[PDB]
Amino acid sequence: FFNVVTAICQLDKPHDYGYAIFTQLPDCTEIQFHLKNLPPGKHGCHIHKSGDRRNGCTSMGPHFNPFNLGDLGNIVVNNNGECNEIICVKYLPLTGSNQIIGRGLVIHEKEDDGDRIACGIIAYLN
Amino acid sequence: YDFFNVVTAICQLDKPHDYGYAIFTQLPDCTEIQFHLKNLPPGKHGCHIHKSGDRRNGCTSMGPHFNPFLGNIVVNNNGECNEIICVKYLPLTGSNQIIGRGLVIHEKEDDRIACGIIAYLN
Numbered sequence: 001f002f003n004v005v006t007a008i009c010q011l012d013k014p015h016d017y018g019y020a021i022f023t024q025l026p027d028c029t030e031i032q033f034h035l036k037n038l039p040p041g042k043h044g045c046h047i048h049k050s051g052d053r054r055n056g057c058t059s060m061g062p063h064f065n066p067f068n069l070g071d072l073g074n075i076v077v078n079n080n081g082e083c084n085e086i087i088c089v090k091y092l093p094l095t096g097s098n099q100i101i102g103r104g105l106v107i108h109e110k111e112d113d114g115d116r117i118a119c120g121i122i123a124y125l126n
Numbered sequence: 127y128d129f130f131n132v133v134t135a136i137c138q139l140d141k142p143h144d145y146g147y148a149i150f151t152q153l154p155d156c157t158e159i160q161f162h163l164k165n166l167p168p169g170k171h172g173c174h175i176h177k178s179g180d181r182r183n184g185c186t187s188m189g190p191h192f193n194p195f196l197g198n199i200v201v202n203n204n205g206e207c208n209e210i211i212c213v214k215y216l217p218l219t220g221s222n223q224i225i226g227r228g229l230v231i232h233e234k235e236d237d238r239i240a241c242g243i244i245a246y247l248n
Binding site: 007008010019049050051052053054061095097101102103104121122123124125126 | 135136138147177178179180181182189219221225226227228243244245246247248
């Protein structure tokens, strides 16, 4: 595969919870999590509309759902507070008119069947 | 007059400490940049877009100057910068967009004393 777009999100609010790598593959947007210091268990993982974090994770606004699918589903954090799982999401563009680069990745307290316990801006890796 | 479908970006310059933020507004003839910086050394400071949004190693991780193919800001004696500039070619969207990339404040006019990721205000 040439010539891949890669993004990084440091989940560093409200504290250092590590980071995630997004890789725009042709069938798939691959997400490699490298989270740490989190509560163990399932946590809802969502793209949020705004990259603004002036009020912490609250400023990142609502779920990003441009077409009326920023829903990545649940991640699982291990008992040591880490998450190194990998998922691949169809139709999660990094570039172009509905891109998630420049927007927000938020880890939610509750699982998808609540409050925002970790968030970061999705940015170009290079 | 009346601009619709404006794209607006925010950059919080919050490493290595809180130095405020800047707002980018892409207008049809230029990109407006409204600075709201604080706690900085008075004097002129170089201001540049850098290619990477990575800040794992601080502002160093944001890499080299970005090729979209800003000049100096003045910090006052209060340590604040509230000026507005307009940059004729500075896209926030498209393949050469600066959203997702870095804004770095340099201590020398045209070490990185402040940086942030340029994001959708949206």
